[PDB]
Amino acid sequence: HMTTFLIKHKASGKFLHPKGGSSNPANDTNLVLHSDIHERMYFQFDVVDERWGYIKHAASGKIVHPLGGKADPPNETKLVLHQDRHDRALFAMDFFNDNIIHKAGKYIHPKGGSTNPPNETLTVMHGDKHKAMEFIFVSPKDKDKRVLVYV
Amino acid sequence: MTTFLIKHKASGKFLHPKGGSSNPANDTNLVLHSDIHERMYFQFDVVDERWGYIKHAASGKIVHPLGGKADPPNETKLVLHQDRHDRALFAMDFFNDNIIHKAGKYIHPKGGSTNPPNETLTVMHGDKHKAMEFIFVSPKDKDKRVLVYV
Numbered sequence: 001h002m003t004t005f006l007i008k009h010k011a012s013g014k015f016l017h018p019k020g021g022s023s024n025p026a027n028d029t030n031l032v033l034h035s036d037i038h039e040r041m042y043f044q045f046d047v048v049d050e051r052w053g054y055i056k057h058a059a060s061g062k063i064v065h066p067l068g069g070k071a072d073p074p075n076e077t078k079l080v081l082h083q084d085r086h087d088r089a090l091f092a093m094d095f096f097n098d099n100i101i102h103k104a105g106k107y108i109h110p111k112g113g114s115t116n117p118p119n120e121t122l123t124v125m126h127g128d129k130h131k132a133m134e135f136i137f138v139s140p141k142d143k144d145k146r147v148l149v150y151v
Numbered sequence: 152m153t154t155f156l157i158k159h160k161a162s163g164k165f166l167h168p169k170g171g172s173s174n175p176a177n178d179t180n181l182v183l184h185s186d187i188h189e190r191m192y193f194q195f196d197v198v199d200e201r202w203g204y205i206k207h208a209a210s211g212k213i214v215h216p217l218g219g220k221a222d223p224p225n226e227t228k229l230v231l232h233q234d235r236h237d238r239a240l241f242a243m244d245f246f247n248d249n250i251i252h253k254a255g256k257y258i259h260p261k262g263g264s265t266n267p268p269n270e271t272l273t274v275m276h277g278d279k280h281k282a283m284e285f286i287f288v289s290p291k292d293k294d295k296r297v298l299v300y301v
């Protein structure tokens with residue numbers, strides 16, 4: 001069993017989407033911020049090892065990858081969806097500090113770091129911590145109710 | 152139903168029911184002790200998102216602030232008790248490595264030592280520091296962290 005949830009950008013109220021909102025995004029489709037809510041921006045978290053797991057797009061089964069699948073992606077590495085499952089797509093959903101951390105230690109950011117980015121803004125990896133990289137994980141039926149993604 | 156050990160990060164001691172009984176009486180103190188055995192295994196029963204009950208596996212008793220108050224003061228002793236209610240809600244913060252009560256204070260060793268001796272009591276205190284950090288590990292591998300939210 002896996003709780004279905006929305007990944008909500010705390011500062012803007014926007015959500016993580018595959019660019020274009022497809023039920024089956026092509027491999028390497030970018031992960032962007034968008035204000036819309038619908039079935040094709042639902043996500044699930046597939047726990048792999050304690051805190052580490054795959055951030056899975058619910059509609060397609062593709063998971064979030066740093067583009068290129070490198071072990072230690074540099075700052076500004078774009079985030080995309082890809083079907084492959086391996087250790088470089090491992091993230092942890094820190095619901096206490098409200099962020100999404102990659103196994104190599106960087107966080108998911110809006111590209112450019114705005115607290116209030118436009119729709120379709122890309123998301124990237126970056127080592128910095130500030131309030132524009134905060135995310136909470138909420139019920140698809142109530143965007144203000146936090147849900148436990150680890151069950 | 153994952154079973155885990157609650158390991159005091161700085162010393163490597165573990166939370167025990169005082170006395171090591173598989174059947175601790177109500178209001179038995181939670182203490183730190185170096186020994187490992189099934190009578191110090193814990194479970195976590197999720198109630199509401201991050202909040203749940205910290206449960207002594209062998210007895211089913213859960214962790215309470217002594218007195219069951221909703222907003223216990225600093226130095227309130229932590230004990231085991233069978234009752235289930237909202238004043239016994241905790242979250243297991245495995246990212247910052249601490250155990251936080253619903254009202255915002257944390258589980259500490261009494262006195263705040265990074266190396267508390269065996270039988271040191273545990274208490275609630277609002278401060279954050281190295282000596283109140285806990286990690287949650289596998290009974291078959293005291294260095295492998297396990298997910299308690301299950």
Ligand SMILES: OC[C@H]1O[C@H](O)[C@H](O)[C@@H](O)[C@H]1O
Nearest residue numbers: 017018019020021032034036
């Ligand atoms: O790029 C993301 C964006 O794509 C499409 O335009 C959809 O219609 C939107 O709802 C959103 O999912």
Ligand SMILES: OC[C@H]1O[C@H](O)[C@H](O)[C@@H](O)[C@H]1O
Nearest residue numbers: 028065066067068069082084
């Ligand atoms: O872009 C991400 C994607 O592409 C890489 O080159 C890898 O081969 C895949 O496993 C996946 O990580």
Ligand SMILES: OC[C@H]1O[C@H](O)[C@H](O)[C@@H](O)[C@H]1O
Nearest residue numbers: 109110111112113124126128
């Ligand atoms: O692209 C993401 C990046 O954008 C800006 O440069 C910010 O200052 C960084 O902290 C980070 O958020």
Ligand SMILES: OC[C@H]1O[C@H](O)[C@H](O)[C@@H](O)[C@H]1O
Nearest residue numbers: 167168169170171182184186
């Ligand atoms: O108080 C804790 C302590 O209690 C008893 O002495 C047990 O033998 C120990 O292993 C430990 O559980």
Ligand SMILES: OC[C@H]1O[C@H](O)[C@H](O)[C@@H](O)[C@H]1O
Nearest residue numbers: 178215216217218219232234
């Ligand atoms: O020691 C804790 C204990 O405190 C009170 O007496 C309550 O009535 C119990 O439910 C329990 O919480």
Ligand SMILES: OC[C@H]1O[C@H](O)[C@H](O)[C@@H](O)[C@H]1O
Nearest residue numbers: 259260261262263274276278
């Ligand atoms: O007993 C608990 C308490 O002990 C000391 O006062 C420490 O300074 C506090 O930070 C706390 O750990």
Ligand SMILES: [Mg+2]
Nearest residue numbers: 196204234235
């Ligand atoms: Mg119960």
